[PDB]
Amino acid sequence: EMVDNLRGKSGQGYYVEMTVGSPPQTLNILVDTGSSNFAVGAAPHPFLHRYYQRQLSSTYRDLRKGVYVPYTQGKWEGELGTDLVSIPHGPQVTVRANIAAITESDKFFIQGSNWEGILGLAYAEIARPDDSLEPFFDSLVKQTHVPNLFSLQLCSVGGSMIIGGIDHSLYTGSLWYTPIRREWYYEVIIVRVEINGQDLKMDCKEYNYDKSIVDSGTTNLRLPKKVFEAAVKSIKAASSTEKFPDGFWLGEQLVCWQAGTTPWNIFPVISLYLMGEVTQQSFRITILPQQYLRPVEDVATSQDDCYKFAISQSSTGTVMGAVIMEGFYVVFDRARKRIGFAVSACHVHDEFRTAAVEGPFVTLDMEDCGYN
Numbered sequence: 091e092m093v094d095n096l097r098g099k100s101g102q103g104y105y106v107e108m109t110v111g112s113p114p115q116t117l118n119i120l121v122d123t124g125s126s127n128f129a130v131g132a133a134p135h136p137f138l139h140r141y142y143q144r145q146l147s148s149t150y151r152d153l154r155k156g157v158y159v160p161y162t163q164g165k166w167e168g169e170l171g172t173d174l175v176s177i178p179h180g181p182q183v184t185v186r187a188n189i190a191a192i193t194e195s196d197k198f199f200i201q202g203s204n205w206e207g208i209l210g211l212a213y214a215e216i217a218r219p220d221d222s223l224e225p226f227f228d229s230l231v232k233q234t235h236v237p238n239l240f241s242l243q244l245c246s247v248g249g250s251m252i253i254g255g256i257d258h259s260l261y262t263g264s265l266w267y268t269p270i271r272r273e274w275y276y277e278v279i280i281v282r283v284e285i286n287g288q289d290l291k292m293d294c295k296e297y298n299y300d301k302s303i304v305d306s307g308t309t310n311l312r313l314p315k316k317v318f319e320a321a322v323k324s325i326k327a328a329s330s331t332e333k334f335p336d337g338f339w340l341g342e343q344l345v346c347w348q349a350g351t352t353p354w355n356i357f358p359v360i361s362l363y364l365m366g367e368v369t370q371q372s373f374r375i376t377i378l379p380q381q382y383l384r385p386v387e388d389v390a391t392s393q394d395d396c397y398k399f400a401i402s403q404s405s406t407g408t409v410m411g412a413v414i415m416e417g418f419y420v421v422f423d424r425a426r427k428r429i430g431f432a433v434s435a436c437h438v439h440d441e442f443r444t445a446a447v448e449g450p451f452v453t454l455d456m457e458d459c460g461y462n
């Protein structure tokens with residue numbers, strides 16, 4: 091009953107239905123592995139269809155404390171409290187959880203997104219105001235018998251969030267695991283990057299400067315400057331039969347082709363090798379252009395298919411965002427401090443190339459690829 095419990099619009103996150111309060115108030119909540127605060131619109135906003143009304147909930151408890159949360163995109167402020175929370179198409183349990191009631195925001199809510207709040211699924215270490223504000227998933231595990239694991243299958247769009255377990259119908263082939271380096275973000279280690287099989291040939295610490303994270307709340311694959319610049323050069327080289335404006339590579343401009351004529355084959359596959367569970371072993375996940383060229387739906391441009399380049403630069407480390415997660419089944423195995431990847435039942439592929447999760451690979455160089 092948890093399969094197909096996510097929806098979304100491209101570039102605007104994936105969301106699950108939740109209820110808050112007594113009697114229950116239904117809200118759509120963005121699933122975010124890149125933060126640790128559960129927060130809901132709690133006052134009118136031009137882009138909110140609905141919001142949390144604390145005065146209607148007899149189970150609301152005010153914590154008499156404000157909270158401010160800034161993201162890489164957007165920010166909000168609100169009032170902390172606790173209330174009863176359910177997930178109608180998740181586990182059939184009700185938990186008392188911390189909730190930030192958003193009273194003011196800036197460039198957070200999105201016009202016509204269909205979500206009204208955000209579920210930070212990462213660890214307390216990055217919760218605001220500090221790590222004493224217990225995250226939702228921690229509360230869920232403590233208060234119920236739910237195993238300490240969830241999985242995401244991100245595929246208008248849809249997918250599944252499976253809480254407490256692994257649904258084998260959502261993937262094919264083998265699950266490969268990479269260790270969670272530190273429990274704050276879902277921090278992982280990239281050991282190697284290839285573009286159409288060609289190694290970028292950097293010290294592997296560069297790939298993880300200053301961390302690498304798995305983040306369902308960020309649209310793009312974001313790369314440290316040095317890595318981003320090297321990747322763009324290699325992708326340009328591979329696709330050099332067509333020349334695109336500089337603005338395209340910066341994500342500031344769309345690239346468009348006559349409907350149905352997108353030249354997928356001129357764009358390369360990107361392979362990210364992730365640290366394995368055994369010394370100097372790794373596995374790779376392979377990303378097709380159908381993943382990193384994000385379609386932008388617009389009826390005005392619909393004689394064409396138009397795309398945004400969804401790889402972008404970062405000054406805060408690698409972010410493996412939604413365009414990386416889509417087409418994989420990603421298991422957040424908190425119990426065993428590891429993240430698993432497998433090929434998803436929902437995958438794009440064309441008749442020539444297929445996204446993959448494969449291994450093992452061995453590396454001679456004994457360098458630790460962690461930045462810190």
Ligand SMILES: C[C@H](NC[C@@H](O)[C@H](Cc1ccccc1)NC(=O)c1cccc(N(c2ccccc2)S(C)(=O)=O)c1)C(=O)NC1CCCCC1
Nearest residue numbers: 103122124125160161162163164198305307308309310402
């Ligand atoms: C990086 C980490 N996780 C960010 C994530 O929590 C946040 C959630 C969110 C979802 C929907 C609307 C706003 C915010 N996602 C983003 O910040 C986000 C969302 C979409 C696109 C982008 N990208 C971006 C990057 C830089 C500048 C502008 C846009 S993109 C276009 O490259 O895909 C970012 C994070 O910041 N975690 C914080 C959580 C709170 C404590 C401090 C750490």
